[PDB]
Amino acid sequence: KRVTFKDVGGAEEAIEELKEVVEFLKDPSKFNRIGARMPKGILLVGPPGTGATLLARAVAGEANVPFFHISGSDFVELFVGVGAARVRDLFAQAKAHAPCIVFIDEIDAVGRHDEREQTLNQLLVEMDGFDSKEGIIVMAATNRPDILDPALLRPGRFDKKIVVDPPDMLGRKKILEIHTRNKPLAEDVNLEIIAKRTPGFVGADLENLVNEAALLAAREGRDKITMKDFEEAIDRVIAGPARKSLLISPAEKRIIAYHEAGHAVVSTVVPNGEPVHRISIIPRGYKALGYTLHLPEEDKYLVSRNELLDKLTALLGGRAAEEVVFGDVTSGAANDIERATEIARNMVCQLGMSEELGPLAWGKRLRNYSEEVASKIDEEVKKIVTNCYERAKEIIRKYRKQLDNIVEILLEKETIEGDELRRILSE
Amino acid sequence: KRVTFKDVGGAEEAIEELKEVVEFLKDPSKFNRIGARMPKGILLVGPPGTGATLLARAVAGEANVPFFHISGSDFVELFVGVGAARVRDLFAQAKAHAPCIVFIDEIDAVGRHDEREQTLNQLLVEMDGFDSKEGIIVMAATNRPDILDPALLRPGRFDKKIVVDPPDMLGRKKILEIHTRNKPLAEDVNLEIIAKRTPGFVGADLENLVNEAALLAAREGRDKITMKDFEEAIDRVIAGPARKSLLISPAEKRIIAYHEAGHAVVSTVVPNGEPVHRISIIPRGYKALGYTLHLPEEDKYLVSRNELLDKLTALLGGRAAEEVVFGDVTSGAANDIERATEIARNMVCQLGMSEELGPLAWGKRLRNYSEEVASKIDEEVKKIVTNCYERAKEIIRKYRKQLDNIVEILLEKETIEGDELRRILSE
Ligand SMILES: CC(C)C[C@H](CC(=O)NO)C(=O)N[C@@H](Cc1ccc2ccccc2c1)C(=O)N[C@@H](C)C(N)=O
Ligand SMILES: CC(C)C[C@H](CC(=O)NO)C(=O)N[C@@H](Cc1ccc2ccccc2c1)C(=O)N[C@@H](C)C(N)=O
Ligand SMILES: [Zn+2]
Ligand SMILES: [Zn+2]
Known part of the structure; x- marks a missing residue:
């Protein structure tokens, strides 16, 4: 079936780059005439399923031009000479149907130590063989861009890459x-x-x-x-999946509830949180007793000091709730604590977000600073994490009643939606 | 003999996941009709004997469908071409008896540099060969999930794993x-x-x-x-086994008795211990002169600061008893001491369980903290272990008489059951 760019999603950058290709296909003369030479081989790079084959077809369909789909895994296991003969045929069929597009799927399966030499080299000859002005363009897809023989990457062949970025x-x-x-x-x-x-x-x-x-x-x-x-x-x-198998005792279910309700409350109360989407007390996969889904609303590329401080407080919300409610904290928050300590270090050591230490990158060459600076870093890291912690315990103390309601609901229903959560916190 | 899930134990998660498979087998149309496509190859991962073959059979028997048991170690050592011919036959017999299940035991023996290429590739063809809608599903078991050729793991084949967790x-x-x-x-x-x-x-x-x-x-x-x-x-x-061979002198048997009785007393007296099940003074295996079995009663997933402090005290009970009773401590408690020091470090460095140091993960990137923090860690670690130690010596001093009774019985009978132990400590 015919395909255009309207049939590929989330690859706008790559499609914009590919827009020139479409034009060159549509009317080669417009380039040929003033010496704007096209690449003979274009390489699209990205993980499997990013539609790197769909894109190829989309480029031909967008210029109403033939498309010769070939796979690089078909040439593996071929008889002596057969692998090279297939390639010679493909391009012969391309020059005749030109302008066109010649695609080579899973190219890293052929462009990679025996008959694979003949087929690869035969490709290298066919590349060097056709005339770019004819309006012919070879593409290829590969999530494995390093396994490729450097020969294919040399000017005259696959000497151009169009980056296919995640959506x-x-x-x-x-x-x-x-x-x-x-x-x-x-x-x-x-x-x-x-x-x-x-x-x-x-x-x-x-x-x-x-x-x-x-x-x-x-x-x-x-x-x-x-x-x-x-x-x-x-x-x-x-x-x-949802491990509704394992048996968690009532006391541990309470701690899990409080812990989770803790994250959600602190996350909501704090100015810069991403809004809570769902709280679940249902175990899931490899050791995950509970969790709080957020529903972003952005596509942000910068993060501020206050936003990280707020995210840090929220990450400490689980443990804060344990401390405040039970007195006796559990091992549950270990990953939270590590994530939080990691942010604080990063603020202090890369982002220039502590006043004592200044807008300096300490670290990177590995640790390359004195013991005196090392203790100032720790001191700043401790002081950031500790303040976000006290701040979390204060949010817990102040919204204790609604926190109580939230774990009561959670223990009964195991799940509560963010709307209901925002509703319980608004008196 | 026919088998169902009622014949497999302790794999509820995997069986729940496998419940969909059963349905798809029972009535493929219910999926086919709305485009819910099934995996052609399912890989069950776990150590040998976890019933990964039993499970396969259980999935077929649970949908009353044919089951073709094959071994991946049978294809090793086969004649040129024979290995590939067997595979072609198996699937031919499957398409005819479909819906069914095609199992491949010890697949990592075939899916792993000569004739093993033909047989493996032949499998890769048969996979790509059959129609999933026919109600056919291939499984395979492997405690060796990394030795497998990445080709088998590519969409269209064994592109799904159902985790078989320990019971x-x-x-x-x-x-x-x-x-x-x-x-x-x-x-x-x-x-x-x-x-x-x-x-x-x-x-x-x-x-x-x-x-x-x-x-x-x-x-x-x-x-x-x-x-x-x-x-x-x-x-x-x-x-x-029980090394009733070696000859232990009466004086060393006393120290061993006291040591062990020490663990058991402190473990029982302390609020959060797991109850003692048995105390033995009988040597066992590679250098193990005595030990105290506990009988859990839970299935707990969280551990608290007080529970670790209590476990720490108990671990120091052996040595406490030596110190208090004999004055001259022995090398026997080295492993206890290392285990105890390890818990304290972990409380202080990962679990955020010291007040001085705060809810910070110190460590992990290896040691990445100042010398000032390093000495606070040691100081906190020492102070935790030391307090649990004094606390153990105080339990020893207070239950000295019953401790005396316990080693007297132990020296005579070599074993005492936890019930008797709880009975001696209750006046
Ligand atoms: C309320 C909490 C439990 C929620 C917590 C996640 C959280 O922050 N949600 O907000 C969680 O589920 N942790 C897991 C996994 C884990 C990973 C590494 C650990 C390291 C040291 C100590 C405990 C660790 C636990 C757990 O504790 N899992 C249990 C089953 C375990 N591993 O025994
Ligand atoms: C009452 C105690 C003896 C009981 C103790 C176990 C215990 O805590 N039960 O509660 C024990 O059996 N230890 C063993 C093994 C061992 C391993 C490593 C060592 C390192 C340094 C020093 C001595 C070490 C001894 C021993 O001492 N085994 C003797 C035979 C040895 N290795 O010579
Ligand atoms: Zn948490
Ligand atoms: Zn001991």
């Missing part, structure tokens, strides 16, 4: 819409929230998510995939 | 019951206590335990396996 929230939204074209979605499904909740997800991750939501609905023999299926599909993909 | 106490209980189906057990046999006493044990460990108890009863030509056989089988499996 932002809006790019993830479009990728979901696309993977959702032929799926029965319930009306309660909000792809914007699912996109918000999958930062770091690429196209192939997003496609798997959609499948996981379908496996979830199919499991219950249902005909529409629902917001529940998506939200649960995200949680499973990230933090594994 | 809790209740899971161990069921595994024992199952391995105890066809064994003559005395009435005095309590599988719950044996399950409690084998934390960390997996299915194959539990099966060996049961055998070891049988070897113990057979040795005395008896017809019923007794609680004695089980308890002794545990002690042998963990700490080796």
